[PDB]
Amino acid sequence: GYVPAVVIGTGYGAAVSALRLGEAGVQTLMLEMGQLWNQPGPDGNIFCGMLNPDKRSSWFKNRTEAPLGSFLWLDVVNRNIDPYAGVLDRVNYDQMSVYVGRGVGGGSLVNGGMAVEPKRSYFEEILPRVDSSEMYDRYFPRANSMLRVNHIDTKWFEDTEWYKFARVSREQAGKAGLGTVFVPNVYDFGYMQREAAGEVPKSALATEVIYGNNHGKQSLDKTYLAAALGTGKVTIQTLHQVKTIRQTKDGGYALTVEQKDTDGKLLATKEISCRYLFLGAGSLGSTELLVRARDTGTLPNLNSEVGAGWGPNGNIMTARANHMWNPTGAHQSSIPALGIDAWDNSDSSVFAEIAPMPAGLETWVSLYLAITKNPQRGTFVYDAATDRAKLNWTRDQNAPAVNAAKALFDRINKANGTIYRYDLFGTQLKAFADDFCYHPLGGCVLGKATDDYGRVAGYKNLYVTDGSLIPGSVGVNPFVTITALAERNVERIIKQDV
Template sequence: MNAHQTLSRRRMLGLTALGAAALAGHTTIAAAPRAAAATAAGVSDGAFVPAVVIGTGYGAAVSALRLGEAGVSTVMLEMGQLWNQPGPDGKVFTGTLAPDKRSSWFKTRTEAPLGSFLWLDLANRDIEPYAGVLDRVNFEQMSVYVGRGVGGGSLVNGGMAVTPRRSYFEEVLPQVDADEMYSTYFPRANAGLRVKNIDEGWFEQTDWYRYARVGREQAANAGLGTTFVPNVYDWDYMRREADGTVPKSALAAEVIYGNNHGKVSLDKSYLAAALGTGNVVIETLHQVKTIRQRNDGTYLLTVEQKDADGKLLATKEISCRHLFLGAGSLGSTELLLRARETGTLPDLSSEIGGGWGPNGNIMTARANHVWNTTGSKQSSIPALGIDDWDNPESPVFAEIAPMPAGLETWVSLYLAITKNPERGTFVYDAAKDRADLRWTREQNAPAVAATKALFDRINAANGTIYRYDLFGAQIKAFADDFCYHPLGGCVLGKATDNYGRVDGYRNLYVTDGSLISGSIGVNPFVTITALAERNVERIIEEDITGS
């Protein structure tokens, strides 16, 4: 059996385990009884396992798969729930246009990125607090969208699987061998994520991408080029959605609160394969609160187990020899800051918390002429980006985003990714027991200026104007107070060595977007995945199987 067949078999075993856990109502997911000595009741208080991975996002999923393949018994601790059990409407995820409690992480009202239409809040709903799939973490002058559940951000993003421009990758991560990344680890990541390209012939004729073709035409009028963007969505499934032969997902406006069909999120790729090794267990609704090191060098974690309504069920202590932090830029950074400032890991570097940035994220929208209809039918999965990254003064990569309202809006919406050099810092707030972000709106001024320069050109070439009514009650054309792509906090080569080993502590690793200093120029998850592939390969070789 070759490597591809082995991976496919493991993925199928893992998918079976995920389905069985959902049917049985278990919060512990394992593909084999021997996996980390787990049972249906879960990993017990006082348990020791060789490796623990905190989180189930991109870097965490890579780490768990490779540890499992190496024969290392591994437990993944995920604060969210497993998303494959249908709700009362027969669907796993709630709809975007009429969301219920499944949409949001313990909110009383949804907090959609498009906060209004004609200054009316039509997208949000009052809901019951619940362990929903999307969280908006609000700081004083910046909010960050993150996914909650088995698969992390892969559950709620648009699936745009973009490999960064090599020149910019080398600028951001000069200590990483770019030849290795682009010849080995980026291809490995794209294969593991199951990245595919849209059929361009279908794209050109389908009504569902009229909005993208209009955006391309208007960019071309300004002398700007566009590029097709690969995705983890199953494009063949989408074509069948359009034909009416399968249930709609991308073509039913599903994206920010999860896709019920079509998208190959991590639970269907890396995590399924990790479970299929028989050496990996996922504990859901388990949140790590504290980390300390014992005298023998092992790590002791205090973990709260809750139900989906937020009720505390148990507090456990789980110990391990190798600890991988994959809770994302916010989660991993907060755990390490808390450990440093409360004295449980006092020798952590002063660099922990630094180098944070929103990947230059800015949203904007334009009002088209009445003859430039964008279509009442719009796929929620983006397929095109405006590529002006070679602009020497203000490089921008702007996704032509959908606005699937089910009616004609004459709106062209964009998520711009800019090269903003500004960085924020996380600090530990002892009174709130959380990481607080020191970042000001003024720090986003370079990103807004770059976005404005690009879209001023497009508006001038097409005789159009901005929309000022989409981003809440304020009259503004640029949404600069939230982001989708949080990066930094535990920067590679500063807070860690060049492979994510945390300075000051042996067998402690960071494996997520915390490692990237604030910007990568495109949607970051392919880079996070590839960097994790590179790092964990070295760690397993030198620190685990070689020790």
């Protein structure tokens, strides 16, 4: 049916948008292709852990996969599974695999919780048409509060076995002159202390994160989406995937929407129309909808920037082998707390997560997810034959990212007399994983495919809200930026357009 506003998806951009729309009195329907994650499963928990993956781990795959970096220890727990509407989707393109959440809350269900503001000077570099004072004075603080960002207690961090892995990399980095920083998070660190004390059910301290956290993590279903539902003006329909978008002859937008069951069986195809349409389907999903609409003629006045300007936030994974006297511990919290800040906006910049590993026995490995500054960009190109927008990115386009990550970690290896691991990513000697992405950014870039508030060029009352707006790179883990930009955008759109 008709609803005044429709929001596609339920990740960060969508959730911010729907809350503010509901508070403005606009009746809003959110359409989410994944599940509402609230049913206890066969182990009694909503989500599977990383040591007991099952069909809940995976969006329509027939075998579970180890978390990147951990195949050598976690392949032993992999199993064949039925294709199911599980929580983590590895989306395979020709030379890049992008990992995204599927469910009410999007990537907030599966991510590491790390809530980090970009460097202002870098924000000003990447988005010069945006007023940076309103961002830092108003919208970043708003996002910080609504997301429930909190900070680890330094004494607990220093003392607990669960963060030895982080302390080891801190000491190694320091020998190279390189500094670390604490990482704020939406996982409740008070709760985490109580997990370590045996006082509450474990989640971060029971090898859970990438298939969801059964406790502790304030994903968007608990924060923005709960508040949106609380307005009385927002509803969410799950297992509903938008397939096509058109402008109707009488104005507004009409959507074709498939309703499936959790086995992927098609139950219904619905037509849903609206006055205001907000896309929050992610970098991949929003871009695909718009490239499809342009190239199949349902939104023919979309511009040539739709599809362009994608980058993986410079994501590169690598690992170092510690000396035998620097074990990282069998018990590693699944939530990172420390990073190495070597980001000065130059082409050598690196912001690298000190990543836990879930093996649960001693491996001596330190793992890192580096964020780098690499100008290469890809384009999503519609394939009418298969009805899919294909990402044309080639692995050689990550060479600048590898080079930057390697230069930084070479400094650490030289100072400490250590070497890389070469065997964590596959059998071929490969120290740098260069064909994955957790942080897809771009495809519908702010001010190029859209105006400076995400209004899609060529159309009225058509908005993009999410990671597709960002120009390929933010220099930090991206959800705080997506959230704050969405706060800015929806406030302005409601004031001027609604």
